[PDB]
Amino acid sequence: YAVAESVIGKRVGDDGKTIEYLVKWTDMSDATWEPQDNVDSTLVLLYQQQ
């Protein structure tokens, strides 16, 4: 699964009709799942605001 950063492009697809946007994704490299105790409350509290 992944989360989108921003949009950096716009084009027309192969069908010649549909509009496609170029989506920048957060790298899932340099990303791990860790138990709630290993993380600092701060970063979590910032995630909750998002």
Binding site for a second copy (CB under 8 A): 1, 3-4, 6-11, 13, 18-36, 39-40, 43-44, 46-47
- Asked if 49 is part of the footprint of Mg ion (rule: CB under 5 A), the reply reads no
Query: What is the C-alpha separation between 34 and 16, in angstroms, rounded?
Result: 44
CB of 16 to a second copy, least distance (A): 14
Contacts of residue 48, Cβ cutoff 8 Å, sequence gap at least 6: none
- Which residues fall within 8 angstroms of residue 22, CB to CB, at 6 or more apart? 7, 8, 9, 10, 11
* 12 or 24: CB nearest Mg ion: 24
CB of 45 to a second copy, least distance (A): 9
